[PDB]
Amino acid sequence: MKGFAMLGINKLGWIEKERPVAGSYDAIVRPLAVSPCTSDIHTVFEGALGDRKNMILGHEAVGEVVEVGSEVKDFKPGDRVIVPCTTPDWRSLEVQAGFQQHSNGMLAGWKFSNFKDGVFGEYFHVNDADMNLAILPKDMPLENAVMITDMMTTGFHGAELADIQMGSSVVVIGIGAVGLMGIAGAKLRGAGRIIGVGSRPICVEAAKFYGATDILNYKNGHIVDQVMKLTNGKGVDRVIMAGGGSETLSQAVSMVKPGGIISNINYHGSGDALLIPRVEWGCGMAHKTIKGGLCPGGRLRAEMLRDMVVYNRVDLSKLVTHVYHGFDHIEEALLLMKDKPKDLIKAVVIL
Amino acid sequence: MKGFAMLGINKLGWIEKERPVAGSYDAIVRPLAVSPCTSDIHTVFEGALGDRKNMILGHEAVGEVVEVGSEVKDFKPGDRVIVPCTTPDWRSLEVQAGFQQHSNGMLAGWKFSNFKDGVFGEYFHVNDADMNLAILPKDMPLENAVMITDMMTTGFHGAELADIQMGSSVVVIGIGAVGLMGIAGAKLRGAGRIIGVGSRPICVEAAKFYGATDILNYKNGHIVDQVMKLTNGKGVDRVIMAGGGSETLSQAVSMVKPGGIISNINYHGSGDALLIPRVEWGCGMAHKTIKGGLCPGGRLRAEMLRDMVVYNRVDLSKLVTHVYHGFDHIEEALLLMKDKPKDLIKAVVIL
Amino acid sequence: MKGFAMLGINKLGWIEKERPVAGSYDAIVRPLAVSPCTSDIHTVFEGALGDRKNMILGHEAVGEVVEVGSEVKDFKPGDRVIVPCTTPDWRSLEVQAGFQQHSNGMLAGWKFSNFKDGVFGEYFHVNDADMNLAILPKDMPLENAVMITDMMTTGFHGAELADIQMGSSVVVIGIGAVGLMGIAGAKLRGAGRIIGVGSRPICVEAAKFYGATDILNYKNGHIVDQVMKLTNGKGVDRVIMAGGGSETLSQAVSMVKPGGIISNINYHGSGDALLIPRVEWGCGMAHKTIKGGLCPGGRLRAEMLRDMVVYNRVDLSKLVTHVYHGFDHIEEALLLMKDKPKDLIKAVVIL
Amino acid sequence: MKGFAMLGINKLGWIEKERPVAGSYDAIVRPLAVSPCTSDIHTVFEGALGDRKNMILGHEAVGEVVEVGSEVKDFKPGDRVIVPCTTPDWRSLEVQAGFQQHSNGMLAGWKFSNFKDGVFGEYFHVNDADMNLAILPKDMPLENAVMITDMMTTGFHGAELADIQMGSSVVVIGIGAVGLMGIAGAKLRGAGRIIGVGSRPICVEAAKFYGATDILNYKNGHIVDQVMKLTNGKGVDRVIMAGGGSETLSQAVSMVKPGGIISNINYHGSGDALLIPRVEWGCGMAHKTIKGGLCPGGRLRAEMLRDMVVYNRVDLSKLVTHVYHGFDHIEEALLLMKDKPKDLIKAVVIL
Ligand SMILES: [Zn+2]
Ligand SMILES: [Zn+2]
Ligand SMILES: [Zn+2]
Ligand SMILES: [Zn+2]
C-alpha cells in the first residue's frame, strides 16, 4: 500500500509498504482525515527516535474500520472511529498500576510513528480495537474529530496533571495547538485567571477564545517578571508547560507559588537537560511539584473527550487553520508544519 | 439596632437587638444586599436548630465594613466586602487537619443564624475580618455578589467533592439555586453529560443555561430508570445531591456506576435517616463513594470564587429572579422563600 | 471431577461436576490449600446470591497450574501460584477507569463462587492467568499464602480506602479475620491509635498483635460512647467497618470526626438498608466521607501483597487457627465457619 | 540571657542576647533538651541564610513553658512541650490553601534560626502557643522527643509525599537521620522493598532496623545500575531523596519507574542547580512526579507524631548516638555535627 514515510533522517517520501494484517483483537483502519504533528518533524528532522528507516508517519487520525479480528466484538467494518494517538496494551502490569500510557514500557502507549507505521498510509493497524477505538459521531466534523486524538487529550491532560482548583491562577507557556488545549482544559477545571504565553497573532486570538484572560509576549520582558508584575509579586498557583525550550522549566518554577504545581506536556527533544533553579525551587523544599506525562489514550479516554465535544464543552474548530482534501496533500501539510508559517495552528488532510 | 429575627418556632418579626461590638480581630459590617435562604425557613418553620429565641436570621450578604478591631490590618471601614456564609475560626486543630468548615465543632464554620445573629440586621458581626472577608469589586452587581456567599460556594463544592473527570457524566438531583450552581460547577470541572433533575420551568431553563445537557422530571418515571435509559443501562460517573428528600441518596447510589462518586450538598432536615440501598451499593463493595459537606468559607474561598465571577467563568445573574430595594422587604422575601412560587430561584434585598 | 458445592439453599454436598477447560489466556489450577469464607456461608445459608444450583464453593486458594492456554506466557504447568479471590477481566472500560474489581459489572472481579465454580474442587478455572496469578514463594507456608487471597487484600484495602495519615486514630469495627487485617493494614499506613471492636478472646489477642492499642467490647457500653470517652469527646479520624450488622454504619459516622473517613469492607447481606444518622452526619455537611469496596485482585495486587509477606511486613500465621490435611475436610471446615466456635479465626485445608 | 549563636559566617560563640517577650498568643519556653542540625552548619559555615549577625542557633527542642500570653488557653507555665521545628502563622491565605509550611512566605513556617533566634538559648519564643505546641508525655525520653521536632516529621513527610502504596518498592538516598526516618516512614506506609543508600556502618544498621531490606554503597557501582540490577532492570516505584548532592535528583529520576514518584526532603544548599536527566525523565512525559517540601509543623502534626511514638509505631532512640548533659555542651555537639565522625547520627544536649 502507499504511505508517506520517513525515508531517512531529513528525508520524506511516499513508499510502497506492506498492508498491515489484523490480529484476533486488532483492527485495520483506513484514514478519513489525518493531521501532521510537531513530533513527526522532531522524528524526521531532529532524529528524536533515531534513524527510522521507511517508517510511515502520523499518529493523529479518524477513520473507518476496514478489517476486524475474530475477537473484536464492539467494532465491525464500516464503523467510523476516532483513533487516540495513544493505543496501550491493556494487558500489562503498568495498566494494573494505573499507568496505561506506559503499558509494557516508558511511552509504550504511543505506537503510531514509533513502534509501528503511522496513520499516513492507505491503511493502518490498531491494536486491541475494542479497547483502543471510539465511535465517531455521525455529524462531527472530521477536522474537529482529529483534534481529539492528540491535541485535546494532551492539553487537557496538562490541565488534569496541574490539579487545578476552582479559582486557581494558571500560566500556560506556549500557545500552540497543545497550549491552546491546555488553556481550554484549564478553564474546564475551574481556573480563574489564565495567562497564555506566546506571540503568534492567530494563536493569541485562539488563546483568548479558549479562556486566556491575559497574554504575555517574550518580546517585552522576562516572562517571570511579567507574570510577577501581573500577579503583584504573588505568582501563580499552576503552570502548564506546553511549548518552548528547556529553559521554560526554570521559568515555571520561578513563577509558581510555593506549594503550586507545574504540569509539563511539552515533549522535549533538543537540549538534553531540563534545569530546576535551586533557589527558586526553595532548594527542593518549596513544595513546587513537577509533573509531566504522555496523553492518555484508549477507548474510554477517547469516548469521554468525544462526549465533551458532543456536549459543546469545547470548540476544537479554532485549532484547525488549514484543511486540505486529497491524500497527496500530506506532504505539503507536513512541510507546512516544519516551516511554521505565522497563520498556522493545525492542518487537517481529509482524504 | 433593628433586625429581622426568629421570635420563636414559626414566628417571624423585627426586633430591637443589641449592636454587636468588634473584637480585636473582628469587623462590624452593615449589609448592602442580603438574600433569604432555605435554611432560614428550616430553622424557623422546621425547628432545624431547635427553639431559637429572637435570633436574627440570614447568612447571605455583601456589605460595608463599619467598624474594625485594632488588629484587623487588611480591612478598614468603608471597605465593601463579600461575606462568605462560612466564617471559620482559623486557629483550630480542625483547620490544621484541613477542615475549616468544622473549626471548633461540626459545622462550626457556619456562624450566621446559628452561633450568632445573622445578616438580616442593621449591622452584623464578622469574626476574624482579615481571614473571613473579601473585597467586593467596584463594578460587581450586588445581587450577583450575594450569590457567591452561599449558592456558588456550595454548588461548586458539590462539583469539587464529586471529583469530576474530563468527560464524566454527572447527574444533579435538584435544580434549585444550589443545584444550578452544582451544574455550573460540574461543567467547570470538565463534565461531559450533565443531567439535571427537576421540573420548575424557570429552574429548568437556568439548568440548561448553566450546562445541563438533559433534564429529567419525576412526573414521568422513576428517576433511576430514566437515567438508566438515557445512559443505555450504563449509569453515570457522578451524582450531586442538591435537593429532595432523603430518598435521593438511594436514587443516587442506584444510578451511579460502581466506582463512581456521590456528592451531597443537600442539608437534610426532616426524615432523620438517609438510607443506602444495600444491593445497589454492591453490599458496600461497589466502590460507590459518598461524600457530603458544608460549603467552604473564609477569605481565600471568597476571593477565588469572586475572581471566577470577575473573569466571567460563571454568570450568577440567572440565579436572581427577585430583587427588592429597602430593608423592610426582608420579610416578604423570606416568606416568598417559604411559599416557593413557581418563578422563584433566589431573591435579593438591596438596602 | 469431585467438588464441594452448594446443592441448594442450606444444602451442602460433594458432587461430580465437569472439569473446566482453559481458554487461550486461561489456566486450570489444582488447589494446594484452600480456606472457607463467611461469604460461602452467606451464599448457601442466607441465599446471598440466590438459589445457586450445584455451584462449587470457595474463592480462597493457592495451587498448582495444571493446564495453560496457548497464549499464557508467564505461567506454565507445575508453577505454584497464589490465586487472588478477585480475578478481573483486564480488557474492559472499568479497568480503563481504574476500577478492576468491577470489570464488566458491579463486583464482576469476584468470579469464584459467583460467576463460576469456586476453588473447592479438584481443579478450578482461572481467567487470564498472566494477569490474575502470582508465583507462590518456595518457602511460604501454604496456610499463610491462602490468607493473602482475600483476608489480607480486603483488610489492607479497608486501610487504603480509609486514606490513613501518619498518626491518625483509627477504629476497626469487627475483629474477625478481615478486621484483623484492617488493623494490620491501618498500622502499616502509619496509624497511631488503633481501637479494635470485638470480644472473642482469640480475636482480641490477634488484634493486639496486629497493632490494636485499645480493645472495646459492646458488652459494656454503647461503642460510640466508649470511643468518645477514650478520645476525650474528640472522636477518631478514621473508622474501618469490617464486621457487624448494618447499624455499624451509624456508629462509624457517630464516632468519626467531621472530615474523617469511614471505610467499609464488610459485605452486608441481611438487613437491606444501611442507615446514616442525619444529625451525626452533620446533615450531610460534616465532610464524613463513606467509602466501601471489593478487595483488589489481579497479579500486581497479589505480587505486592506477597512481597510484603516475604519482607515480613505482616505475619499472616495469626489468622490461621485451624489447619486440616486432606480434601475431605472441606465440609468440616466450612461447617466450622458456620458454627463459629470461640477459638476460630480462619481455617485452612491443605490437600 | 545566654545563647549559642552565629557571630558571623564561620564564627560560633555564646552571647548575651535579650530575653524574648511573649505576645498575647505566644509562649516563652525554656529548653529541656536540644539537638544540633545539619542546617545549623549550612547556615554558619555555608552562609545558607547569608551573613546572620549574632542569631541564636537551633530549631530542635522540647522544653517547659515559662511564660504564656494572656490569650494562650491550652498551655500554661510548667507545661512540658514538644516544639515542632516548623511553627507557622496559622492565620494566612497559605494556610487556607492547605500549605502551613509556607504561611506568609516560602518556608516561612521555619522560624527558629531563620526569622528569629533559635532554641540554643536559655529561653526561646514560640509564636501562637495553642497552635504550635504539643504536650510532652511524662514518660517520654527527652532525647527521643527531640527527634520528633524535625527528624521524624521530615523523614515521614518524605514518605508521605512519596504517596507510597502497599507493596511499593522504595529507594531512600542518604541514610543520615532524616533518611533513616524516611525509611521508617516508608515502612509505615506499607512499602515492600526498601533500599537504603549509604555506607556509614552506624547508619546502615539503623537503616536495617527501621525497615531497609537492602543497603547500597556508592563505593561499588553507580547507584542506578545497582538498583537496576537488584530490581531486574524494572526499577523502583518510589524514591526519597534525603541526602547527597544535587546529582541525586538525576539518579532518582533514572531509577524510578515511569509513573513513579520522587520525594525530596533534602535541603539543597551548595550547587545552585538540580538537574533532571531529559532522556531518563522520558523527556518530561514519563509521569515521573517530583515533589519536595519543608516538614509540617504545628500542634496537630506534633501531636500525631507524638502519639505514634507513644503507641510504639517507631523507636526514635536509634537516631540518638550522643547524649550530653549541661547547656555548655551545645558547642561540642554542634562541632561534632560539623566534623561528622563515623559513629554519629544525632546528638542531644539535655540541659
Ligand atoms: Zn500529535
Ligand atoms: Zn444560605
Ligand atoms: Zn473470602
Ligand atoms: Zn533540623
From Swiss-Prot, chains A, B, C, D:
Keywords tagged on the record: Metal-binding, NADP, Oxidoreductase, Zinc
UniProt xrefs under PROSITE patterns: ADH_ZINC (PS00059)
Record-listed E.C. numbers: 1.1.1.80
Gene3D superfamilies: Medium-chain alcohol dehydrogenases, catalytic domain (3.90.180.10), NAD(P)-binding Rossmann-like Domain (3.40.50.720)
Top-level taxon in the UniProt lineage: Bacteria
Cofactors named for this entry: Zn(2+)
Signal peptide: none
Enzyme class: oxidoreductase
Residues annotated to bind NADP(+): 175-178, 198-200, 218, 265-267, 340
Record-listed Zn(2+) binding positions: 37, 59-60, 150
A GO molecular-function descriptor: zinc ion binding
Reaction equations catalysed: propan-2-ol + NADP(+) = acetone + NADPH + H(+)
pH dependence: Optimum pH is 8.
Segments crossing the lipid bilayer: none
Binding note for cofactor: Binds 1 zinc ion per subunit.
Subunit structure: Homotetramer.
Family: Belongs to the zinc-containing alcohol dehydrogenase family.
Function: Alcohol dehydrogenase with a preference for medium chain secondary alcohols, such as 2-butanol and isopropanol. Has very low activity with primary alcohols, such as ethanol. Under physiological conditions, the enzyme reduces aldehydes and 2-ketones to produce secondary alcohols. Is active with acetaldehyde and propionaldehyde.
Name of this protein: NADP-dependent isopropanol dehydrogenase
Organism: Clostridium beijerinckii
Lineage of the species this protein comes from: Bacteria, Bacillati, Bacillota, Clostridia, Eubacteriales
Gene responsible for this protein: adh
